[PDB]
């Protein structure tokens, strides 16, 4: 490890394991139907996903 600015890991220490937010960036689905217009099968599929 180096302190010279480009090394972002300096001063960071591992304490264990757990959850973290992935590097993915989700875009909201366009023209989403209103709650009464949603089909039941595809609704929970996209929601739990």
């Amino acid at each position: 490890r180096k302190p010279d600015g480009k090394d972002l890991n300096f001063g960071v220490v591992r304490v264990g394991v757990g959850m973290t937010r992935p590097e993915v960036t989700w875009g909201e689905p366009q023209n989403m139907p209103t709650d009464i217009e949603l089909e039941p099968v595809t609704g929970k599929a996209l929601q739990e996903f």
Binding site: V17, A45, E48, F49
Partner: protein, 405 residues
């Protein structure tokens, strides 16, 4: 008692004798021990041990199982003269994986834990079904002759034998891998059964003593001839040769002249008794330079396993035929069976191989059980069945108890 000398296995196979501290905990030794084996490899001119990515160094038994890092060498059942292995065990830490929609999730996981049917297995199943078919065909053909011993049975069976054998011939010449050989072997094994009844079905007139002699002869010859040229499936072929040869002698005697079955049965029993004593000697005589030792060891073991098995079949068939609930002093053969069973039960402990030791042990128990059943079905009575049932259930329970307790 302060130290113990043991062999340590290292990279690529070098065994080194070391004198270890008998009471320090094993985790304290693995670091300097690794240095020592590396230093010796360097002086020997070999390449040292090295790590690969993420992992750790551990000390294990020859079976690879690692020793508990905190326990003393004396706390574990490690004695002077034993051997251990130093090994690198890689890091298993990795992300967890989750699939939420259940239909996909069932398919994905279920497809990784089991094997789907494929063309290689399909062929073996086909071979297995045809073998099962012909043994049924010969069975029905062999049953017809008892009512009409005409030429039909032999004429019909002979052509099948030739045809199956002709197919097996092309398969044997073409085989390239062990999968191919298994297919061919199952086919060849099945060819012996039709040819046997085909020959035995040739002598005309009512079936009996004269027909039997040809069958067991050709059976013994066919089983023996296959082994000579094939060199595979030693156990199954060998067992047939023994039972065939012995029956040929017995059949010949009965056909020529024999006052009683007891006479022949007693003779066979004695022949097996002496054979049981000679068994290991027969196996020894029947069987880059290192390879020669490995081949001989399993071959000898194979022949012995079939030999012990075949004799077992003969004595159980003979003993169950010798004892009888109506003939004379009914108790005399029953006690003789007991003495015979004890010898086999006692001698079975002298064999280290599981199948050799287990088959011998099982042979004695089945003899006892068969006699109990014999004296129960015939000369039937409420007390007789009652008495036999109690004995037959407690007999094995006692054997299990002697080993379990």
């Amino acid at each position: 008692p302060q130290a113990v000398v043991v062999g340590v296995m290292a990279g690529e196979g070098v065994q080194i004798g070391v004198l270890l501290d008998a009471n320090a905990p094993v985790s304290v030794m693995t670091d300097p021990l690794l240095k020592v084996v590396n230093s010796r490899l360097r002086e020997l001119g070999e390449a040292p041990l090295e790590a690969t990515g993420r992992g750790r160094w551990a000390l294990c038994l020859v079976d690879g199982a690692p020793l508990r890092a905190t326990q003393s060498l004396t706390e574990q059942d490690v004695y002077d003269g034993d051997r251990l292995w130093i090994r690198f065990i890689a890091d298993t830490e990795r992300r967890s994986q989750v699939i939420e929609h259940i239909s996909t999730a069932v398919a994905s996981d279920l497809s990784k834990r089991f094997a789907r049917i494929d063309p290689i297995v399909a062929v073996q199943v086909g071979a297995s079904m045809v073998a099962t078919g012909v043994v049924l065909a010969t069975g029905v053909l062999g049953w017809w002759r008892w009512h009409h011993n005409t030429w039909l049975t032999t004429i019909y069976t002979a052509v099948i034998g030739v045809l199956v054998l002709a197919v097996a011939m092309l398969l044997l010449m073409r085989a390239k891998t062990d999968a191919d050989r298994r297919v061919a072997d199952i086919m060849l094994m099945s060819a012996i059964m039709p040819v046997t009844v085909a020959a035995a079905a040739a002598p005309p007139g009512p079936v009996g003593s004269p027909q039997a002699v040809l069958g067991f002869g050709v059976l013994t010859v066919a089983a023996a001839l296959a082994l000579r040229f094939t060199g595979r499936r030693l156990g199954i072929y060998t067992t047939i040769v023994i039972i065939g040869a012995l029956t040929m002698l017995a059949a010949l005697a009965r056909m020529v002249a024999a006052t009683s079955a007891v006479t022949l049965l007693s003779s066979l029993l004695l022949i097996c008794v002496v054979a049981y004593h000679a068994a290991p000697a027969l196996s020894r005589r029947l069987a880059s330079s290192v390879r020669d030792v490995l081949l001989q060891a399993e071959r000898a073991r194979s022949f012995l396993s079939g030999l012990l098995t075949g004799l077992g079949v003969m004595v159980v068939v003979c003993m169950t035929s010798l004892c009888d609930p109506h003939t004379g002093q009914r108790w005399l053969p029953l006690i003789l069976a007991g003495f015979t069973s004890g010898f086999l039960l006692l001698r079975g402990r002298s064999y280290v191989d599981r199948w050799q030791s287990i088959t011998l042990a099982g042979t004695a128990v089945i003899i006892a059980a068969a006699v109990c059943v014999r004296y129960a079905l015939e000369l039937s009575s409420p007390l007789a069945v009652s008495i036999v049932a109690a004995i037959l259930v407690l007999l094995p329970a006692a054997g299990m108890a002697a080993a379990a307790h």
